[PDB]
UniProtKB/Swiss-Prot annotation, chain A:
It is found in: Cell membrane; Apical cell membrane; Postsynaptic density; Cell projection, Dendrite. The gene is MPDZ. Interacts with CLDN5, DLG4, GRIN1, F11R/JAM, CLDN1, NG2, CRB1, MPP4 and PALS1. Interacts with HTR2A, HTR2B, HTR2C, PLEKHA1/TAPP1, PLEKHA2/TAPP2, CXADR, SYNGAP1, CAMK2A and CAMK2B. Interacts with FAT4 (via cytoplasmic domain). Interacts with DLL1. The PDZ domain 1 binds NG2. The PDZ domains 7 and 10 bind the Ad9 E4-ORF1 oncoprotein. The PDZ domain 9 binds F11R. The PDZ domain 10 binds the C-terminus of CLDN1 and KIT and the C-terminal PDZ-binding motif of HTR2C. The PDZ domain 13 binds CXADR. The PDZ domain 2 binds CAMK2A and CAMK2B. The PDZ domains 10 and 13 bind PLEKHA1 and PLEKHA2. The PDZ domain 13 binds SYNGAP1. Residues 13-99 form the PDZ domain. It comes from the Eukaryota. Member of the NMDAR signaling complex that may play a role in control of AMPAR potentiation and synaptic plasticity in excitatory synapses. Promotes clustering of HT2RC at the cell surface. The chain holds residues 1859 to 1951 of 2070 of the full protein. It is linked to Hydrocephalus, congenital, 2, with or without brain or eye anomalies: A form of congenital hydrocephalus, a disease characterized by onset in utero of enlarged ventricles due to accumulation of ventricular cerebrospinal fluid. HYC2 affected individuals have variable neurologic impairment. Some individuals have other brain abnormalities, including lissencephaly, thinning of the corpus callosum, and neuronal heterotopia. Most patients have delayed motor development and some have delayed intellectual development and/or seizures. This is Multiple PDZ domain protein.
Length: 106, 92
């Protein structure tokens, strides 16, 4: 009754437990200092078998706005990876539509 | 560098290409259906960059040019790919 309001604005909030594989099954790109330059952090790819796909609220090309309650504003690529790698229990992510990458089924 | 032979939907989503919103970036497999044709081959992986499709280089292809080629094609579809290797993205 609060996620629903933000989704209408539309920021999407997702809760994820990591697998028995200790993985979210997503690849993130961007961030300050990333191999792409200082660009926002987004989801580049999603593993077929993995946890994030089962959310069905996470999409390739979503920008990551917050991770485990922390804004990604000014966050480096390496910090975002460290945060998600070390996180455990329920992992909160909030995202918005980006077109940093758009994907098409074929 | 791997060569794959698909018989044909391919059950993959592709991203990148020339004039993509990042800039001109190689086309890659962004997602896959684990039960689809690409997955059934066991030589394609999310994160592969597509070097050639149907015997032609992907280099200078727009995202639109790549998608229309793969949707339009049928029979034997060749692809050659190289692993992204977590160079411009990181698995988590």
């Amino acid at each position: 009754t609060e996620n629903l309001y933000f989704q209408s604005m539309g920021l999407r909030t997702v809760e994820m437990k990591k697998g028995p594989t200790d993985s979210l099954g997503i690849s993130i790109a961007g961030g300050v200092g990333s191999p792409l330059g200082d660009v926002p952090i987004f989801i580049a790819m999603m593993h077929p078998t993995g946890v994030a796909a089962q959310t069905q609220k996470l999409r390739v090309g979503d920008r990551i706005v917050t991770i485990c309650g922390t804004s990604t504003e000014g966050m480096t690529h390496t910090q975002a990876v460290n945060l998600l790698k070390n996180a455990s229990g329920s992992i909160e992510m909030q995202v918005v539509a980006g077109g940093d990458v758009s994907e098409t089924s074929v």
